[PDB]
Every structure is written in C-alpha cells, then in structure tokens.
Amino acid sequence: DDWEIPDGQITVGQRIGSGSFGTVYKGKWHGDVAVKMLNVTAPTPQQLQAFKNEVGVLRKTHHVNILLFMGYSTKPQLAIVTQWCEGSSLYHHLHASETKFEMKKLIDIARQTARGMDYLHAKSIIHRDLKSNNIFLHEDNTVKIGDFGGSILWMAPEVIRNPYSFQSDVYAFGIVLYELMTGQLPYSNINNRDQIIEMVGRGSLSPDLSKVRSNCPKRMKRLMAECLKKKRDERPSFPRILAEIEELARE
Amino acid sequence: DDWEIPDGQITVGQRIGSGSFGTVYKGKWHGDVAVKMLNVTAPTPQQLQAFKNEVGVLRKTHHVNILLFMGYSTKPQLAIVTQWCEGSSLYHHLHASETKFEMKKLIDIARQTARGMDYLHAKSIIHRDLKSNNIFLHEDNTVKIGDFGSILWMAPEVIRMNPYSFQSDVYAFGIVLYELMTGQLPYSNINNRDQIIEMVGRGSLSPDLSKVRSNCPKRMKRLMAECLKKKRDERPSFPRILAEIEELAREL
Ligand SMILES: Cc1ccc(NC(=O)c2cccc(C(C)(C)C#N)c2)cc1Nc1ccc2ncn(C)c(=O)c2c1
Ligand SMILES: Cc1ccc(NC(=O)c2cccc(C(C)(C)C#N)c2)cc1Nc1ccc2ncn(C)c(=O)c2c1
C-alpha cells in the first residue's frame, strides 16, 4: 500500500465534531473528504501514539461497508483522512427523525452491517464501540461502519462488570438489531443509569423483545435473541450471523 | 497490512465475462465481491507481470470514485478481488439504455469522474483507457473508475506514434464529457472507422459540439472543448479541470 499523503495538499473546511482523538473538519482533497485533526503545534507522545495506532488498524481495512481509509499526513499536523459521508447515521434516521424504514430496508441495513462486521472480525479487529451512532448511511443506501465523536445500551454484560471480544461486538450487533426492528432504544422505561447498568450487568435485565414489528420475520427475531445471550460463550459468530441474514434476504 | 486471501475463503461462480487470459466471477467473500481470475491459461510472462503491476497500483489507490481493491489470491489460482458494482456502466446508461439523465446527474458524474481521475494523476498514475465502458455507476449514483481497441476516446497524439501521457487521458475524459453532454457517441454520423482513425490524428475530424444538449452550461462547453484540444501541451490538467466543475456545480 501507499498511505502517506503529500503534506500541503489538504485544505480544511467547516469543523464538524470534536472526534474521539482530535477535532474533525470536513475537508477537500480530490473531492469531499473528512479529516480528524490534532491542532497542537507539537504533539505529546500520547497524542502521537493514538495517531500511530489509529492508522495501524485502518491500514488493514478494505470493505464497502467499512469507512474508506484514504491516508495520513504527519507534518502540517497529525491528521487522518477518510472519505466524506453524505447523509445521516443509522441512529438519527430511526430516533431523531420521523421517517420509518421499510422492513426490506431494515434488514438490508442489518445485512450490510453484518458484512462490514464480519470482515472486521475476519482481519482480527475488535470494534469495541458498535452502535447506531457509529453506523453511517452513506448516500442513504450504503452502510458505512466507523468510529465517530457515551455508549451504554450496546454494552455486553461482561463489559459492565480483557472483556472486549468478538462476542462482545456480536452482542452489540444484537442491540443494533433491536433498534432496527423496534425503532427504539432498549430499557426505554428505566430512568436511572446506575439501575440499568447494574441490572443488565447482574444478568437480570434483558431487552424487551415483544416490541418487535409484526412484519419482522420470525427467524430474524431468533437470531437477534442469540446475539443477546447473557453468557458470552453462548453467542453466535458473525459468519453464522452474516449467513442467516443473507439467506433471509434472498427470500 | 497483508492483502493475500487464503484459499477456499472465496466462493466463485456467476461468471460475467471471459478474456483469453482471464475470467470474472460474481463471488462471495464477507459479502458481494468480484474476482478476476487467470483460469483460462497458464500465465504468459506478459499477463503474469501485468498481473503483478495491476495489483501494485491497486495497492496504492484509496478513493471513493476509484474501484475498491480488496485483495488477491495466489493458491487456488492467480486472482484479484474487488467490490461488486451494482448497476451498469456509463456507456450502457447513455447509449445502450432508454434512461436519459437529468443535467444535474450529468454534472455529478462529470464531477465524480474528474475527482477519481484527479486522484489517479496525483499519485502519478496513467489510466490509458478512459471510456464510458470503464466508468461504473455503482448504486446508480456513485461513479466508480476502473479498467475492465476502443478508439473514439483515442487522443490524436496516441493515434500517431510517448504517446501515452496524462494529456492523453484528459482528451479521453473530454470525449466522456461529450457522451454526457450530448447523450451521443462522437462521429455517430461518420460510418467507417478507418476514416476516423486518420482524420482524428490528422486534425480533419473534430467532435461536433452543436450536438450538445440545450441544458448544458456555457462553462461546460469551454471546458469540454479545452480537454479535446488537438495540442496536447495546451490541454488542461485535471486539478484545473476539477476546479471549474466543482464551482460550476456549487452554484446549483
Ligand atoms: C474523519 C475520521 C477519521 C477517522 C475515523 N476513525 C474511525 O472511525 C476508527 C478508529 C478505530 C477503529 C475503527 C474501526 C475499524 C474499529 C471501525 N469501524 C474506526 C473517524 C472519522 N470521522 C468521520 C469520517 C467520515 C465522516 N463523513 C461524514 N460526516 C458527517 C462525518 O462526521 C464523518 C466523520
Ligand atoms: C474483478 C476486477 C478486478 C480488478 C479489475 N481491475 C481494474 O479495473 C484495473 C486494472 C488496471 C488498472 C486499474 C486502475 C487502477 C488504473 C483504474 N481505474 C484498474 C477489474 C475487475 N472487474 C470488475 C470489478 C467489479 C465489477 N462489478 C460489476 N460488474 C458487472 C463487473 O463486471 C465488475 C468487474
């Protein structure tokens, strides 16, 4: 691969977010790009190491449902560059908007999400923060998985109490399925954070699966259940998860 | 960090086309993939080295309008894998289809095509076969540039014998603009190809820009003209080409 970007080529536009590592600016570089940037005139090794490692994982990714990693610049500032994403996240479309999706579109999102996730785990990568907030509907058609700039509902029980695993991401994908099939965040009636955190971690509290749509296929409900099994070992793997969802789509 | 894909991970079938050296299969690998394979023949040194270089450049490309490179396989056979492309090429949509595009989409395609090309040339890459056939409308919205003779896109200096340069690609992009802005293949009225080959090289034949669509903005007429200018040196560069297109689009 060739990942280093000539330095003076990037021009930063409107600041968008504060990111998880640096401030994020919608930029322009041979088209529309997004740039997470650090604006310190000289980077502390902490700041430098997060950069060095954040690039290290992205160096491995090449999938249509994973966000596109385009390169990095070291010298104007420590910067990471990716494609710009036209549209809104999965989170916004279900919760922060009136528009409900068609059941077909609902599974299609779950499908593409599975493909991106399957590919990630295949290259031995752990997301550690799968949520509808970190799932972007590029052009309202294509699912793009990333890490953008507080995730509690998608947290597996063993994470509440090396707890991050492939199975912890699987569970997180389960919660996302709930969002798609209910249009809702789990534990909507429980108010207090410590109550949810403790009840879900102790193994008493599990998402109310009766709220699923009528149109939701019975088989889809079963898969969603398996993903949310309290015992991490008893959770399915994304190969089978991807498998089942696609066979559903063909019908 | 390492792009080679272990054998039996990919499940092939649904072949689309077949060269004299290779075949393309709609595959399955963590989703929908496309696989170019060399299962037509034991690789000749040309094709085998062409393979080696084809991967070497794809390793370097990282763009939304450039085709997505996902990896390669050595052990079942020498294979290259990319994203699957949903839709049909620009060629098919303009000429081999009923669908006429809204002028907006013509510019959007023209802009995304420029972006992909600009990125390519920036990394010091020459395409050498820009045509509407090698431009794929993924999901009918997003342009994907790849490589899948064809002479309507052939620059004058290429007919005669570098000859292949960035300026030869610009001309080829010019013809594509003609396709987009006329809904037509150039010299549609001229019958025999052999006349065209000589005249385009000789300076006799020039695209008829009167066939341009009514909706086409004046700035587009000028840019399209400049791109297919006989003099290769005075031909614009894609940075400068892209520049006009974006600000043109920005005013709509
Ligand atoms: C600009 C950027 C650079 C790097 C990352 N990094 C990650 O997402 C990350 C860091 C570590 C691991 C992963 C994995 C591979 C685990 C995933 N998924 C991802 C995010 C971003 N944010 C980013 C990227 C594109 C965007 N398009 C449109 N809009 C409006 C945005 O807000 C936006 C934000
Ligand atoms: C499977 C494959 C692998 C590699 C390449 N190679 C190139 O495009 C190529 C070869 C050399 C240079 C370049 C560059 C980098 C210059 C560009 N652009 C590209 C093409 C393909 N063909 C390919 C890829 C996706 C497809 N989706 C839908 N349909 C229906 C297709 O026919 C199809 C074909």
Side-chain angles (χ1 to χ4, degrees):
Chain A
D1 339 330
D2 188 293
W3 292 120
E4 188 177 9
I5 301 170
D7 300 332
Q9 292 196 4
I10 318 179
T11 68
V12 290
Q14 334 177 24
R15 179 266 309 161
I16 303 301
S18 312
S20 62
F21 154 76
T23 27
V24 172
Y25 300 81
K26 167 171 185 175
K28 270 243 160 60
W29 190 75
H30 304 92
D32 292 295
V33 297
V35 201
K36 188 156 75 173
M37 200 186 203
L38 183 72
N39 348 98
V40 195
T41 49
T44 66
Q46 292 83 1
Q47 272 166 164
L48 172 70
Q49 187 68 17
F51 171 85
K52 278 188 177 297
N53 286 117
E54 184 165 350
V55 174
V57 48
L58 286 181
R59 271 175 65 104
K60 309 204 175 60
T61 64
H62 297 309
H63 196 282
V64 69
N65 297 111
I66 304 307
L67 191 55
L68 181 66
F69 174 59
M70 306 189 47
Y72 63 94
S73 288
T74 47
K75 261 46 260 322
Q77 298 287 339
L78 291 185
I80 291 172
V81 191
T82 67
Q83 68 170 121
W84 182 250
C85 279
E86 286 292 343
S88 193
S89 68
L90 192 168
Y91 176 84
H92 181 89
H93 279 141
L94 291 188
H95 315 143
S97 75
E98 303 142 73
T99 66
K100 111 186 182 313
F101 285 79
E102 288 296 326
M103 180 54 65
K104 180 52 208 173
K105 190 60 185 300
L106 287 174
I107 73 176
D108 184 38
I109 295 182
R111 158 180 217 180
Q112 293 179 4
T113 311
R115 294 173 159 183
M117 279 309 296
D118 190 35
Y119 178 80
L120 287 177
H121 286 191
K123 299 199 87 79
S124 294
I125 312 178
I126 305 293
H127 193 341
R128 298 179 161 192
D129 194 89
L130 187 55
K131 52 180 181 180
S132 56
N133 200 26
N134 289 357
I135 298 174
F136 212 109
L137 289 203
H138 188 45
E139 309 272 348
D140 300 322
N141 273 334
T142 298
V143 163
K144 286 295 198 296
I145 308 182
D147 186 18
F148 318 101
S151 338
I152 290 296
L153 305 182
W154 305 262
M155 284 180 51
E158 311 93 16
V159 181
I160 295 177
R161 311 172 291 219
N162 316 334
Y164 285 139
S165 59
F166 306 86
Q167 295 138 337
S168 74
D169 281 355
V170 166
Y171 177 95
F173 175 74
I175 307 280
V176 174
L177 288 176
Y178 187 91
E179 308 189 58
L180 285 167
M181 288 311 172
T182 65
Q184 284 197 259
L185 292 163
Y187 328 120
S188 46
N189 55 308
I190 316 284
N191 241 23
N192 192 282
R193 247 181 62 103
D194 300 327
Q195 275 186 238
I196 305 187
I197 290 192
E198 177 171 351
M199 287 179 49
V200 174
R202 283 290 182 74
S204 66
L205 189 52
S206 45
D208 188 15
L209 306 187
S210 68
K211 270 180 179 183
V212 292
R213 273 137 153 278
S214 71
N215 308 100
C216 177
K218 178 59 212 305
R219 27 194 299 188
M220 192 68 172
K221 185 146 147 292
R222 303 280 298 219
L223 174 75
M224 166 181 327
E226 286 174 33
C227 287
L228 302 166
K229 290 181 179 177
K230 296 163 48 181
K231 276 194 82 168
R232 47 180 274 171
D233 161 80
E234 306 192 318
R235 292 169 200 161
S237 52
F238 268 107
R240 296 195 51 251
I241 295 177
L242 181 47
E244 202 126 349
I245 298 177
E246 300 234 11
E247 189 179 43
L248 185 51
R250 276 190 61 261
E251 304 168 23
Chain B
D1 168 89
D2 189 32
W3 301 124
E4 184 181 9
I5 301 169
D7 187 355
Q9 290 196 3
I10 317 180
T11 68
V12 291
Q14 334 178 24
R15 79 153 167 84
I16 305 301
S18 312
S20 268
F21 288 105
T23 313
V24 172
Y25 298 82
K26 166 70 164 302
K28 271 242 161 301
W29 188 74
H30 305 93
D32 293 295
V33 297
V35 201
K36 188 157 75 173
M37 287 160 42
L38 301 183
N39 57 338
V40 192
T41 179
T44 65
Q46 209 296 126
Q47 269 280 0
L48 173 70
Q49 84 138 11
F51 170 85
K52 240 308 171 185
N53 170 256
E54 184 165 350
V55 175
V57 286
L58 286 181
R59 266 173 61 130
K60 309 204 305 177
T61 64
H62 307 307
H63 196 282
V64 210
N65 295 111
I66 304 307
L67 192 55
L68 181 66
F69 173 60
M70 306 189 48
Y72 61 94
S73 195
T74 314
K75 287 174 183 175
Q77 28 238 281
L78 249 356
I80 290 172
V81 310
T82 67
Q83 68 170 122
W84 185 250
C85 279
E86 286 292 343
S88 67
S89 68
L90 190 50
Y91 179 91
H92 181 261
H93 277 141
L94 293 187
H95 316 297
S97 170
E98 303 142 301
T99 67
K100 59 186 68 61
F101 284 95
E102 49 277 39
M103 181 53 65
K104 6 186 301 174
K105 278 224 71 66
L106 284 331
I107 272 80
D108 184 38
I109 294 182
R111 161 174 47 102
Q112 293 178 5
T113 311
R115 294 172 159 183
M117 280 309 295
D118 189 34
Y119 176 80
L120 287 177
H121 287 191
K123 300 199 88 163
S124 294
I125 312 178
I126 307 184
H127 193 287
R128 297 180 161 106
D129 191 15
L130 230 184
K131 52 181 180 180
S132 56
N133 327 27
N134 285 348
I135 297 175
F136 212 106
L137 290 201
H138 189 45
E139 228 84 349
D140 300 31
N141 73 87
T142 298
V143 163
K144 238 67 175 186
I145 308 182
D147 185 13
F148 318 103
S150 297
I151 56 189
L152 306 181
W153 305 262
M154 198 80 47
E157 79 238 36
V158 183
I159 293 284
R160 338 171 194 138
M161 309 292 224
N162 316 126
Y164 287 84
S165 58
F166 301 144
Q167 295 138 337
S168 74
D169 281 355
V170 167
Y171 176 95
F173 175 74
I175 307 280
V176 174
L177 287 176
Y178 186 89
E179 307 189 58
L180 285 167
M181 290 312 171
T182 65
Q184 285 196 6
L185 292 163
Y187 327 120
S188 46
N189 53 308
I190 312 201
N191 33 309
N192 70 323
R193 68 148 164 173
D194 188 29
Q195 272 185 357
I196 305 187
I197 291 193
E198 175 173 351
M199 287 181 305
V200 68
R202 280 294 181 207
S204 304
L205 236 195
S206 307
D208 189 15
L209 305 188
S210 68
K211 268 55 179 55
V212 150
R213 226 137 156 178
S214 182
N215 309 100
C216 177
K218 309 297 298 303
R219 262 178 292 186
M220 191 67 60
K221 299 275 298 182
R222 183 171 179 82
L223 175 75
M224 164 180 35
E226 286 174 33
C227 287
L228 44 78
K229 172 184 305 176
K230 295 164 182 177
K231 277 191 276 165
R232 47 177 274 171
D233 287 276
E234 304 196 318
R235 223 131 60 181
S237 52
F238 268 106
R240 298 193 304 201
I241 295 176
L242 182 48
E244 346 276 25
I245 298 177
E246 301 235 15
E247 59 188 14
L248 187 158
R250 276 292 173 176
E251 304 169 23
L252 293 175

